[PDB]
């Protein structure tokens, strides 16, 4: 696979930014910080028993962030491969 060097450079920069930002988001989501609450796919029933459930959904979103950061890692490697290929 091949593409123009400028597009490949855009790819690498985009991938790096994605990795960093989503690492930050996953870190804070796994910390369960309140700041990100509204992004949690919480359900009304959960606010009865205790906060452990919302912790686990926080972690679900955190894992999901880490996964997307992984896809960005693969994309970054891919785009770097193309950049050096050109």
């Amino acid at each position: 696979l091949c593409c123009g060097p400028k597009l490949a450079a855009c790819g690498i920069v985009l991938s790096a930014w994605g990795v960093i930002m989503l690492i930050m988001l996953g870190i804070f989501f796994n910390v369960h910080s309140a700041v990100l609450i509204e992004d949690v796919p919480f359900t009304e029933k959960d606010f009865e028993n205790g906060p452990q459930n919302i912790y686990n959904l926080y972690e679900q979103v955190s894992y999901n962030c880490f996964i997307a950061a992984g896809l960005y890692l693969l994309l970054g490697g891919f785009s770097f491969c193309q950049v050096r290929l050109n």
């Binding site: 994605g18 999901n64 962030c65």
Partner: protein
């Protein structure tokens, strides 16, 4: 050089009006800072909720791929 009472007095009148009105207007203008800063915050927040809230607010692990795509979109839209 030569002095004209009328021209000099109107010159100072122009400067006085300029100064006072300019100060009032500049004080109002510096509220531009608040206006555009609140604009920055508002645009950032609404774009956050309109784009990456979509990906962050899903239950299953597939939201990892969802977040990949939606974050690509979010990155481009934010830079733009």
């Amino acid at each position: 050089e030569v002095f004209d009472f009328g021209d000099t007095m109107v010159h100072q009148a122009i400067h006085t009006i300029e100064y006072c009105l300019g100060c009032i207007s500049n004080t109002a203008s510096y509220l531009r800072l608040w206006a555009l800063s609140l604009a920055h915050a508002q645009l950032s927040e609404v774009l956050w909720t309109m784009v990456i809230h979509i990906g962050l607010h899903v239950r299953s692990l597939a939201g990892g791929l969802g977040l990949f795509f939606i974050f690509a979109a979010f990155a481009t839209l934010t830079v733009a």
